[PDB]
């Protein structure tokens, strides 16, 4: 029961962290792609 909740919250924090990381990577790639396109 509560083991489900512990796993869920751990995955939730991991997913939040990796989502911020992915957003940052997307911004970097977007700026580089904009430079290339220009």
């Amino acid at each position: 029961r509560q083991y489900y909740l512990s796993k869920i919250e751990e995955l939730q924090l991991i997913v939040n962290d990796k989502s911020q990381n992915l957003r940052r990577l997307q911004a970097q790639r977007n700026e580089l792609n904009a430079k290339v396109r220009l």
């Binding site: 029961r1 083991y3 512990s6 796993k7």
Partner: protein, 270 residues
């Protein structure tokens, strides 16, 4: 009142087993207060547990499991919690028992999937104590009436027997069946295990008092079993429920592939 730990660890070095047993009881009394002094003296607990002549070797295993749970040695803490025997009271709501339960479940799931993908002859023997504590957790989940959680753990552990038990013993058989069907179709990537789950679902559906023949046919299409669908249609014809037959055939055409329909129409003719 006590001042430090050195007294009890010093008692660990005595020769009389009863002194060691009393010291182990004292250690299990206060291990959440101060574990560090026992961490370096763990070897004493190890040799005490490894002595087959110790009547309370299970208490030594429990103490070492607690200490390693402090240390984070969760593999070794799991090993010595399994070695703790029945003294590991699952029903207790302590933090230690709870996190060791979580580690037990994770280890069981890992070993279970590793055995499942492997063929029959290469299955590494799962520890009986780990399987037993997992079964105890399954029973506790069943008693607490949280049937969905037990279903999910059973799916994780590839244990179709517990999955069937949870589905049948649940108060709402059709609702749990629908929930399991949605889960299996939308979440499971293991094709062979999804097929096993679908076969279990089909068997439960047929053994239901009023079979959900529509869902049976859907699951059979997913399993690619035109023979079973043809036999179901023949039985429906014999049993006069023609509206089931017609709706089933229409769903079959709307969903099943051309080869599936050809096989069904062939078995229907013969």
């Amino acid at each position: 009142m006590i001042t430090s730990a050195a007294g009890i660890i010093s008692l660990l070095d005595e020769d009389e087993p009863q002194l060691k047993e009393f010291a182990l009881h004292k250690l299990n009394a206060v291990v959440n207060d101060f574990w560090a002094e026992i961490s370096e003296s763990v070897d004493k607990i190890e040799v005490l547990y490894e002595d087959e002549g110790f009547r309370s070797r299970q208490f030594a295993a429990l103490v070492a499991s607690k200490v390693f749970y402090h240390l984070g040695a969760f593999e070794e803490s799991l090993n010595y919690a399994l070695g703790a025997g029945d003294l590991f009271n699952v029903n207790d709501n302590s933090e230690y028992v709870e996190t060791i339960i979580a580690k037990c479940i994770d280890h069981y799931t890992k070993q279970c999937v590793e055995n499942a993908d492997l063929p029959e002859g290469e299955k590494k023997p799962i520890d009986q104590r780990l399987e037993g504590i997992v079964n105890k957790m399954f029973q506790r989940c069943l008693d607490d009436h949280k049937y969905k959680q037990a279903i999910g753990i059973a799916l994780e552990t590839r244990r179709l027997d517990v999955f069937e038990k949870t589905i049948l013993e649940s108060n709402d058989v059709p609702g749990m069946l629908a929930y399991s069907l949605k889960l299996c179709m939308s979440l499971m990537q293991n094709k062979q295990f999804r097929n096993k789950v679908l076969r279990v679902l089909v068997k439960i559906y047929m053994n239901l008092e009023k079979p959900d023949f529509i869902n049976v046919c859907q699951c059979l299409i997913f399993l690619d079993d035109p023979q079973a669908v043809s036999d179901i249609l023949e039985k429906l014809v014999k049993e006069d429920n023609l509206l089931m037959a017609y709706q089933i055939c229409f769903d079959l055409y709307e969903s099943a592939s051309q080869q599936f329909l050809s096989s069904v129409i062939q078995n229907l003719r013969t």
